[PDB]
């Protein structure tokens, strides 16, 4: 028979693509008026009733390890933090000689030498006058020059003090696609991050993603619906990190019990430096606590899921971190504005062979000079928070690394890992992909154009 | 017994539907290509990026419309042509294509001949314009 080309405009066809998504937030942040970086510089109001269309018959290939959404989110968060820090105070004058003594006023043995009482000369609002002041500095934030100390950052760069009016608390962020692009979502319960998905949908915006910055433990994230999920770009390659998603959260209570006082020191015209004035009461180690039974059950489930890839009879070892700097060797996070680094050796100290409120306690240290994003030369100073700090969070996942193993295959040991925040974003964006619409189609019909 | 969906399919709702049935919801995709799914940026990296994306979207939409006009199919969602179908591109009969295939499958099948078809459409439209001018100059 006679067939002719026919053109269709607006056909449902798409290809894998990369683009620039935009971000949306709920009105609640606008009602806080605490100047959240995301709601202030990047995001717009969220749609009251987001649209989700379920694509019947559609099976789509996903790969969470080659998703540009993660890269865009990493770049966006870094840029927003830098932008929020631009108008803040630069602590150049703070790079001076410090005369430091111990703080032995009712301290515990574990907190001996952790805090230092440092006196120094500082500039005033008058360029021709100097003021002798004192402050308390954490042992990690100072280094001995030769009783003489200097700030750790003084030989690398000057730190920018965080503006107390700016809030970095994670508020949910939705990523939304512009014209000509779509976001596809995999709703399979046992989707491992790579391969086909048979239950696909298209969404205007992603679900509320909280950009939580943490290491060795994913906090306040999404949970698996059926069972614990193990995800890795290549499980057999020990050099690739493993992302573990829990089906039930694990409560973690972190606290700084020391009652701290914030003191303002005028270092220039309109320039104030917020230091630690004094400690009211005794000095105790900040610490985190998790239930022993819940952690043991979660580790058992994780081991059960790992044995599907590493053998039903292989011995599984959970050991602490190998080495590196404080950020990677410790569970690092932000509690009420203070930067905690906690020792997780008590969490990964187990053996499994394939055969009640003890409340595991993790000691923690606190830092004020912060190097984020694994960068160098852009240090940030965190002003102290007045009072006693307590936060409660949910461990929803882990980042793990496997040792080489020597190919013996008899045993496998896993250690907490992290550092690169891109894995944290992948833990939430694994189910999303971006596609570009191709609206033009050509097909045969019996329709023929007039002459 | 007939069960009825609450609302029309929506954006990409016919991606898994047959090519014949998907023709009833081309307008939604066409609209999305320009306006997205149915305030002011600030100077900065983020705002500049968004403005670049919007300009790119406008350019892409205009490129598609330019192609349609060049084929003589401007202002139409379904446009018939004078270009005969070559069985080399595909030998499937009409029933298979329009009742047992999706547009994604069809694109996978005939993705190799798309540019050839586009060029043929261009030539046919140009010849149509020339012949129109000559035939109607004879008037």
């Amino acid at each position, epitope marked *: 028979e006679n067939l002719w080309v026919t053109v269709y405009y607006g056909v449902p066809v798409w290809k894998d693509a990369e683009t620039t998504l935009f971000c949306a937030s709920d009105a609640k942040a606008y009602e806080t008026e605490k100047h959240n970086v995301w709601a202030t510089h990047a995001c717009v109001p969220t749609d009251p009733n987001p649209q989700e269309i379920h694509l019947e018959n559609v099976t789509e290939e996903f790969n969470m390890w080659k998703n540009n959404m993660v890269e865009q989110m990493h770049t966006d968060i870094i840029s927003l933090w830098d932008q929020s820090l631009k108008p803040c105070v630069k602590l150049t004058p703070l790079c001076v000689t410090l005369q430091c003594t111990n703080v032995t006023n009712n301290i515990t043995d574990d907190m001996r030498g952790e805090l230092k009482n440092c006196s120094f000369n500082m500039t005033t609002e008058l360029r021709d006058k100097k003021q002798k002041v004192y402050s308390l500095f954490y042992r990690l934030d100072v280094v001995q020059i030769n009783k003489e100390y200097r700030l750790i950052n003084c030989n690398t760069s000057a730190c920018t003090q965080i503006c107390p009016k700016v809030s970095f608390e994670p508020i949910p962020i939705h990523y939304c696609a512009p014209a000509g692009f779509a976001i596809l979502k995999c709703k399979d319960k046992k989707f491992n991050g790579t391969g086909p998905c048979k239950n696909v949908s298209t969404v205007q915006c992603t679900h509320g993603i909280k950009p939580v910055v943490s290491t060795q433990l994913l906090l306040n994230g999404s949970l698996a619906e059926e069972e614990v999920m193990i995800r890795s770009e290549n499980i057999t390659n020990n050099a690739k990190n493993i992302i573990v998603q829990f089906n039930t959260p694990v409560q973690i209570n972190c606290t700084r019990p020391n009652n701290m006082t914030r003191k303002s020191i005028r270092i220039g015209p309109g320039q104030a430096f917020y230091a630690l004035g004094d400690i009211i009461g005794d000095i105790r180690q900040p610490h985190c606590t998790v239930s022993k039974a819940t952690w043991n059950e979660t580790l058992g489930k994780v081991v059960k899921q790992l044995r599907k890839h590493f053998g039903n009879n292989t011995i599984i070892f959970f050991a602490n971190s190998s080495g590196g700097d404080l950020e990677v060797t410790t569970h690092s996070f932000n509690c009420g504005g203070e930067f905690f680094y906690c020792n997780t050796s008590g969490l990964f100290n187990s053996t499994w062979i394939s055969n009640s409120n003890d409340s595991i306690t993790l000691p923690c240290r606190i830092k004020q000079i912060i190097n984020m994003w694994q960068r160098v030369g852009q240090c940030m100073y965190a002003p102290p928070i007045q009072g006693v700090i307590r936060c409660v969070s949910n461990i929803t996942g882990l980042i793990l690394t496997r040792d080489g193993g020597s190919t013996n295959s008899t045993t496998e040991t896993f250690r907490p890992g992290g550092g690169d925040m891109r894995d944290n974003w992948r833990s939430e964006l694994y189910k999303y992909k971006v596609v570009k619409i191709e609206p033009l189609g050509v097909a045969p019909t019996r329709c023929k154009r007039r002459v | 017994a*007939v*069960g*009825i969906g609450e609302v029309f399919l929506g954006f990409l709702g016919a991606a898994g539907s047959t090519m014949g049935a998907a023709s009833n919801t081309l307008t939604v995709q066409a609209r999305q290509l320009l306006s997205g799914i149915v305030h002011l940026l600030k100077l900065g990296v983020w705002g500049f990026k968004q403005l670049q994306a919007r300009v790119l979207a406008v350019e892409r939409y205009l490129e598609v419309q330019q192609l349609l006009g060049i084929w003589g199919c401007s202002g139409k969602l379904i446009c018939c042509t004078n270009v005969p179908w070559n069985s080399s591109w595909s030998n499937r009969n009409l029933s298979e294509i329009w009742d047992n295939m999706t547009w994604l499958q069809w694109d996978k099948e005939i993705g190799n001949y798309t540019q050839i078809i586009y060029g043929l459409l261009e030539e046919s439209q140009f010849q149509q314009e020339i012949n129109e001018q000559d035939l109607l100059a004879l008037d």
Partner: antibody
Amino acid sequence: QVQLVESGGGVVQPGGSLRLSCAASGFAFKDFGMHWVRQAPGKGLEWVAVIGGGHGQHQSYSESVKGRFAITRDNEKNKLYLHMDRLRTEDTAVYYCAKDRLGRPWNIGGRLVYYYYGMDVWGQGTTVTVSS
Amino acid sequence: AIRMTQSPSSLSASVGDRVTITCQASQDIKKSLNWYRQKPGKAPELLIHDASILQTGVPSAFTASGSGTHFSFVINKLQPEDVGTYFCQEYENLQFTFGPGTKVEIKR
């Protein structure tokens, strides 16, 4: 062959809740709609609820059970779930799950429509009992 | 909305005689009928769909004829493995109303 096995039926007090699960095999679960049918003891058959195929975007419930029953599928699990909530003395009966001859979602005029043509294959039976 | 009635309530018939069951609908359905058999203490089976077509997997021992509002189920020779509750169902609307059921037994 096309086999349906039903489970999850026990005893629950009035005003409580119960869940019934049907496992399907021998056919494409996603390609057919499914019905929940109730046989009261010594009485005739009474249709309860139906869910469309695929993603199950369509659900129809009997007026007797409307507002307190919910039907659900799991195509990966090949499971059909009925969420009996706010049970009453008359709900006690034998509940069957049956495969419809059709019910696959269809695109007709840009709309999602389901054509149900009855029940071709039934399960074997699962009894629920309410007491107090 | 659509009321479905089976007559007679029960039937006692000899081995090898015509058995007829009448089905009445309040509103016309005119093609949407299913004939089910539930043997004593067993799951129901589907015999005829659309009121005229026998279901695959069953011998041609049953017939159905009807339209509009009136339908009829006809049984071939009443073999011993034939007793069962015969149900007359409609699928014209989303209610899938069932019939009261008809009890068929052999002479005894």
